Each structure stands twice: as C-alpha cells, then as structure tokens.
C-alpha cells in the first residue's frame, strides 16, 4: 500500500537547519535572499496552497507533453500556417520572439528562489517552477522551429532576445528588472504574484481560445498545455506577501507590487492590446482589450490585494483610464514603425473594424481615427512613403517603449521628464517616472535605443544604420500584414 500525500508531505519541506560552519548571512546573502530581517523561524510559516510531489510531477508532465507533441505531429503536414490569416501568423511570430527565451530565463528566476529563499516550501515549489519554465522555453522553441523554412521571421523565436531590436530591449528591460536582478522574495512577489498570477494565467487562457477560433489547434494545444502549469509556480508570491505583511514590511511589499503591476501593464499594452483590437479578425473578436482587462485582470487584482491586506496601487484610477488609450498608441506606433519589428503588424482600420473600434471605445474615430485618416488618404493617393518614418520616436527610460497617447480632437500626449544628476530622462507616464525615482540607482546609467543613437553608438547614425544595429534586414523587417488589402475599401 501507499501512504496518502498529506501524511508525509511536510517532511519534504522540513529542510531548514541552523548553519554552524558558515554564518546564516553567508549562506543566504541578503542581496540574493531578501529575507528583510525576518527570521528563519518566521519564513517557515510559508505554506503554499497547491501541493505537488516529484512522482506526481513527472507523471502528470509526461502526459502533458505526450499530448501536446502528439497534437503537433498529427497536424504538421496539414500546413495550417500557410493558409492562416496573416494577422494570426504575425501574432505567433511576435509571441515566440518575445517570449521563448524569457520563459527559459524564468527558470533562472525560479532557481534564484530555489537556492536563496529561507522558506523551505518556497525552495521546493521553485524547483518545480524551474522545471516548468524549462519546459516552456523548450516547447516554445520546438514548436516554431517547424516553420523556419517558411520565413526568416521564425528564426527570431530564438534570435530576438539576442538583438538590440527595440521590442527585444523593452522585453529584457521588463524581465531583467522583475525577475533576473531581484532577491528571492522580490522575485516571488514581482514575477509569480504580479506578473504570472496577475496577467499571464488569464492571458494564456484567452490566447488559446483565440488560437482555436483562428483554426490553429497546434498553437491552441501548446498554449493551453503551458497554461495548466502556471498556477503550480505562480502561487509562490501570495505566501511571501503574507509573511511580509504579518511581519513589519507591508510598505516594502506594497511598493514591490505597485512597481511590478505597472511594468507588467506596460508590456501587456504593447504585446497584447494591439493583438486583440487590431490583429484578430473582426468576426473573431469576443471582447475588446479593455473589456478583457476589466473582466479578467483588474477585478482579480483588487480581490487578491484585499485578501492580502494590501491597497490598490496609487495609480489605479489612471490605469483604468489608460485602458481606453495606451494600447491604441502602441498599435499605431508599431504599425507606423513596422520595418523595425520582426512580424507584420495588421493595420486593422477598415470601415467595419473602425465601427467596431467606435463601439468599444467611443471617441476613437475623432482621436485615433484622425491619424489613421491621414495614413489612409496617403495610401489611397499613392504616397506610401509618408506612411513609414524618417525618425525615431522618443523612448521611455523605464519601460523602453514610445511615449504616445491620445491624438486628434482630444490631444493629450505628455512626457513626464526628469532631470537627474545632469541627465534628462523621458517617461511615458507618471507611474513610469515614479518607478525610476523610488530606485534611481537601479536604472540610472541604462541607455535606451534613442540615448544610444544620440551618444554616437549607432553608426552610420541614420535609419539604415539603426536597422542594422537592431539586426533587421529585408525579409524580417515588418510591413502591413494584409499587404494593404484594406486600402481597397477606401479606393
């Protein structure tokens, strides 16, 4: 007979001991552990709600991969990717380039907690997390690899995070700050609670639904499989936050959650927002990005924070407002600067789409629609050259994204500048500037793509030189997803 898990589970996390031959501070260096003066004894109160043991892990995860790899092999010769909507193809190319190597780097962020957390339940759950992100980084390479012969853009599943392309820099900026350069306890909070529990758990459910709706059962099966792994490790920050709050550290905990949720939001506004509102074909749009955010993200955050004894971040109301705006700017920026990305952005501004946008966002046509009006006229009137740029946008020094906001009849674009030790910094929002000011030594001497351009680091110092610096050449440089097919509706 076998024991019941509950009868022996605790012995798997009865693993703390009092060091003698080295000191506790030596064994758990504060810059790595982040124990914050809270004793080993008080960290041992850490109790993860979802429990799993090694034998269960290997058995369940063996079946997951049997399934997902089976689906892939069955559907491979069907060549769906060749007849998929090109906004769908672009959604996948963006997904893989932005995420595959950051999934893999997340296994290091899990390894940080596995070695350095004082809570023994955290160290074991992080060992399972480290395994999970290993899976994710690998399967999100194996899957796009199938397509390398279709387009060099699929090479960017591996290449992207090795480049200075601006979206890559913006992705490393986010991940390196949230998960790679923080102590174990901060990683548990910023990565697993704010980003994974807070955003990607529901994002992936949505994305698998969109994939299935697009007719892409390989990618739907991939994403849905990865998603089932998330909560096993995303659970780790909730317990850490409880211990910080119960001990003397609620403000420290509040501040980490505030920073992490804002930075996550900014990444989401460029990587997810445009996809939902513009790349997904109109007849497949279940709800708007704003609607998705309110139903599946924002409410859940308030619930989590309440239950933990924390407050809504100071910027919450502003954040709610920005659901009407920010991603429309990130979309227009990415489409306008399309040769600077490795996928083809879908303009998404046909008459039919524009009336959808107007319902989902009253005011769209007379703000966003204004810029799109001009763009559309130029394409109708044979001046495509005025639909691509001849300069760089201003980049935020926190999130490494263009500073953009409401245009047209309610113009409201602002720069939250800051002069600090003789340098002038630019910020796309009040929250972005604040993330800098609460910890300036963490960001001070970083330079964004614009900073580098202005400093002489991009040579030839012209647009062509900037493209080469970003590793982009014809064949991967983006262009309109539907090859301007939507222009025919306007003549």
């Amino acid at each position: 007979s076998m024991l019941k898990r509950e009868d022996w589970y605790d012995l798997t996390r009865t693993t703390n001991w009092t060091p003698k031959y080295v000191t506790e501070n030596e064994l758990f260096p504060e810059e790595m552990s982040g124990a914050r003066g809270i004793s080993m004894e008080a960290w041992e109160k850490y109790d993860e709600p979802y429990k799993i043991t090694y034998p269960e892990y290997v058995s369940i995860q063996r079946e997951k991969d049997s399934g997902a790899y089976s689906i892939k092999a069955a559907l491979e010769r069907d060549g769906f990717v060749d007849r998929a909507d090109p906004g769908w193809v672009s959604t996948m190319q963006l997904h893989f380039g932005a995420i595959a190597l950051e999934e893999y780097a997340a296994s290091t962020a899990e390894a940080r907690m596995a070695r350095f957390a004082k809570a023994p339940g955290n160290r074991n759950m992080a060992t399972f997390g480290m395994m999970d992100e290993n899976r994710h980084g690998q399967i999100q390479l194996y899957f796009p690899y199938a397509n390398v012969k279709r387009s060099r853009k699929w090479d960017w599943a591996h290449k992207a995070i090795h480049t200075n392309e601006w979206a890559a820099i913006a992705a490393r900026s986010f991940f390196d700050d949230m998960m790679m350069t923080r102590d174990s306890v901060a990683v548990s909070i910023m990565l697993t609670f704010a980003f994974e529990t807070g955003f990607t758990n529901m994002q992936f459910l949505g994305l698998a639904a969109d994939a299935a709706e697009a007719g892409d059962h390989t990618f739907a099966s991939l994403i849905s499989s990865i998603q089932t792994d998330e909560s096993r490790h995303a659970q780790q920050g909730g317990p850490s936050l409880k211990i910080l709050v119960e001990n003397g550290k609620k403000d420290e905990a509040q501040q980490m959650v505030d920073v992490a949720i804002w930075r996550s939001w900014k990444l989401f506004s460029v990587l997810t927002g445009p996809i939902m509102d513009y790349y997904t074909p109109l007849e497949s749009r279940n709800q708007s990005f704003k609607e998705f955010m309110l139903e599946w993200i924002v409410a859940q955050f308030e619930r989590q924070l309440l239950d933990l004894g924390l407050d809504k971040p100071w910027y919450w109301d502003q954040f709610m407002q920005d659901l009407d705006e920010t991603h429309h700017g990130m979309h227009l920026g990415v489409w306008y600067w399309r040769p600077t990305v490795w996928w083809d952005p879908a303009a998404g501004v046909s008459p039919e789409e524009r009336e959808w946008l107007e319902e989902k966002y009253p005011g769209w046509n007379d703000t966003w629609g204004q810029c799109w009006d001009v763009i559309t006229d130029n394409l109708v009137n044979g001046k495509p050259e005025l639909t691509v740029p001849e300069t760089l946008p201003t980049i935020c020094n926190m999130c490494n994204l263009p500073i953009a906001h409401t245009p047209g009849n309610k113009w409201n674009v602002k720069d939250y500048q800051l002069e600090y030790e003789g340098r002038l910094y630019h910020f796309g929002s009040e929250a972005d500037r604040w993330c800098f000011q609460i910890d300036p030594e963490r960001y001070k001497n970083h330079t964004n793509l614009v900073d580098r351009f202005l400093k002489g680091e991009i040579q030839p110092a012209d647009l062509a030189g900037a493209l080469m610096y970003m590793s982009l050449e014809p064949g991967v440089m983006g262009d309109d997803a539907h090859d301007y097919e939507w222009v025919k509706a306007y003549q």
């Binding site: 429309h328 700017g329 227009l332 920026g333 306008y336 966003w368 204004q370 810029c371 009006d373 001009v374 763009i375 130029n378 005025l386 639909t387 740029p389 001849e390 300069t391 760089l392 946008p393 201003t394 263009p402 500073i403 953009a404 906001h405 409401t406 245009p407 047209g408 009849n409 113009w411 674009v413 602002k414 720069d415 500048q417 002069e419 002038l424 630019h426 614009v450 351009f453 202005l454």
Partner: protein
Amino acid sequence: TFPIMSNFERDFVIQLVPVDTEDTMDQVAEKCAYHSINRRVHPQPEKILRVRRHEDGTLFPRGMIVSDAGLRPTETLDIIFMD
C-alpha cells in the same frame, strides 16, 4: 546641431527631431512639421505653428533662436497651432 523631442499638436507620439542651434522657432516648427503634418496630422493653413517648452508651458516667440532658448539637450517641445 541639437536634439529635441517634438510633441506635435494632434499627433499621438513624441519624436526625436534634430534642429540647429541657429534655427528660429519658426524653422524648428518646420523641421518638426515634417514628421507629423501630412503623416498623421492634417495641415491647418489658417494657423501658425508655435513652439512651447513642454515642461512648463513657456511660449517661445517665432523669431527666437534655439541658441537663446535655454534648452536641455533632448528637451521636449510642444508644437502647437496658433494665429
């Protein structure tokens, strides 16, 4: 040669626009307009393009030159339609 950031009225994005230290505000607005008017913003020929410092809202006169404006490199400037 002097970098500024152009926040052009009715555009959606702030952009890097190199200007010259000898440019008048009028010639700065011209240089900015190039990256916005007929791109993304419709002309307004009943109007005159003015330059103001984004940070504090200070309006620069049309003839004032960059050299005399007391700008920090990379300073953000609003380029607004006036009469």
